[PDB]
C-alpha cells in the first residue's frame, strides 16, 4: 500500500480537494506545479503554509490539489486551506503527534483560517 490522506478546503463557492501521500517532495495544483498560481499577487497567499512550517516537511511528501468553482480570490483561499489541513492530517496519521500539534500551533498562531473555515452566515438583529 501507500500512505495517503484526503482533505477539503472552501471559500464561498470554491472547492479544493487535496491528496497528500508519501514521496519525493513535489506539489502540484490542478495539473500544474504550485509556482504557476494565476492571480499572481496571491501566490504568496498560497505559499503561506509552506514557508510557515518550512520546506523539509514538504520535501518528503507529494501533494496534489485540484480546485473548481468560485473565482480567483476564493480559489486561492480554498487552495491554501486544503494544503494546510492535508499537511497536519498527514502528520497526525503517518508521522507523530508532537509534530502534528506543533504544526497546529504554528498555523493557528499565524492564521486560524488555514484550518477551520469561517462561513459568513447572516445575523438578523
Amino acid at each position: 500500500a501507500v500512505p495517503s490522506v484526503q482533505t477539503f478546503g472552501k471559500k464561498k463557492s470554491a472547492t479544493a480537494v487535496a491528496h497528500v501521500k508519501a514521496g519525493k517532495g513535489l506539489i502540484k495544483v490542478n495539473g500544474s506545479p504550485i509556482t504557476l498560481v494565476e492571480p499572481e499577487i496571491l501566490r504568496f497567499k498560497v505559499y503561506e503554509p509552506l514557508l510557515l512550517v518550512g520546506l523539509d516537511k514538504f520535501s518528503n511528501i507529494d501533494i496534489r490539489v485540484r480546485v473548481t468553482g468560485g473565482g480567483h480570490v476564493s480559489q486561492v483561499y480554498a487552495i491554501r486551506q486544503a494544503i494546510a489541513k492535508g499537511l497536519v492530517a498527514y502528520h497526525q496519521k503517518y508521522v507523530d503527534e508532537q509534530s502534528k500539534n506543533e504544526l497546529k500551533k504554528a498555523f493557528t498562531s499565524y492564521d486560524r483560517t488555514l484550518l477551520i473555515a469561517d462561513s459568513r452566515r447572516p445575523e438578523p438583529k
Binding site: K28, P33, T35, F44, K45
Partner: protein, 213 residues
C-alpha cells in the same frame, strides 16, 4: 561554543521553488522585500492602534475586522491604507488594483528615500493624526465651536483618510498617477515638510482649536 542543528540533509523539493521564496521562508517580509523588524511607532498613544507587530506577506488579509468596535484597530496597517485607497466611486471593490498600486508606491518610496517604505508609511500616519478638534455647540439659535480632544482610533482613521484623499485630489487631473502622487505624499508627510495635504489639513484643524479653546 554553542550550536543547535535541526537541519541534517539539503532540502530539494522535486518541484522547483525559487531562491527568493526560500529566503522568505527564512524571514517573512512584506512583498518579499520589506521587513517588519526595526519598525517602531515613533509616537506613543498609537502603539496599540497602528499595528506593525504581526508580519504579513501581501496586503490581502481577508478577515472580519468590521464586527466589534476595535477589531478595525487590530487590522494590520497596510490593509487599512489599501482599503482606503480602493475607497472611491469607480474603484469600489478592486482590492487587487489597490494592492498593485500600494506595491508600486512602496517601490517608489524605497527608490527615492533609501530607508524603509513601511517605516515611511508609519511615520506619515503618526505625524498626520490630528491632536485636537472642535465640535459645534447646540446653542439654539447661535452656534460656535468648542475645542475637544481626539482619541487614537479617530486619529488613525483621520490620518489614513487625509493621506488617500490628498493623493487622489493631487493626481486628479494631471499627467501623474495615484502611485506616484501617493509616494510623494507619504514622503512629504513623513518629513513633516508642510507641503502635503495631510500636514496642511491637520495644522488647520489644530490651529482653529487652539484659537477658540
Amino acid at each position: 561554543d554553542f550550536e543547535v542543528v535541526e537541519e541534517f540533509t539539503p532540502v530539494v523539493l522535486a518541484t522547483p521553488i525559487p531562491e527568493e521564496v526560500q529566503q522568505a521562508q527564512t524571514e517573512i517580509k512584506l512583498f518579499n522585500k520589506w521587513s517588519f523588524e526595526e519598525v517602531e511607532v515613533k509616537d506613543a498613544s498609537l502603539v496599540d492602534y497602528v499595528q506593525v507587530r504581526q508580519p504579513i506577506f501581501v496586503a490581502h488579509t481577508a478577515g472580519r475586522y468590521a464586527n466589534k468596535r476595535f477589531r478595525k484597530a487590530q487590522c494590520p496597517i497596510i490593509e487599512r491604507l489599501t482599503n482606503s485607497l480602493m475607497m472611491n466611486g469607480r474603484n469600489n471593490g478592486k482590492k487587487l488594483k489597490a494592492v498593485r498600486i500600494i506595491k508600486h508606491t512602496l517601490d517608489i518610496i524605497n527608490v527615492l528615500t533609501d530607508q524603509n517604505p513601511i517605516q515611511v508609511v508609519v511615520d506619515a500616519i503618526t505625524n498626520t493624526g490630528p491632536r485636537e478638534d472642535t465640535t459645534r455647540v447646540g446653542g439654539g439659535g447661535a452656534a460656535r465651536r468648542q475645542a475637544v480632544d481626539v482619541s487614537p482610533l479617530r486619529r488613525v482613521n483621520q490620518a489614513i483618510a487625509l493621506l488617500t484623499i490628498g493623493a487622489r485630489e493631487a493626481a486628479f487631473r494631471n499627467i501623474k498617477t495615484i502611485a506616484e502622487t501617493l509616494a510623494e505624499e507619504l514622503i512629504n508627510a513623513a518629513k513633516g515638510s508642510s507641503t502635503s495635504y495631510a500636514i496642511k489639513k491637520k495644522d488647520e484643524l489644530e490651529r482653529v482649536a487652539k484659537s477658540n479653546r
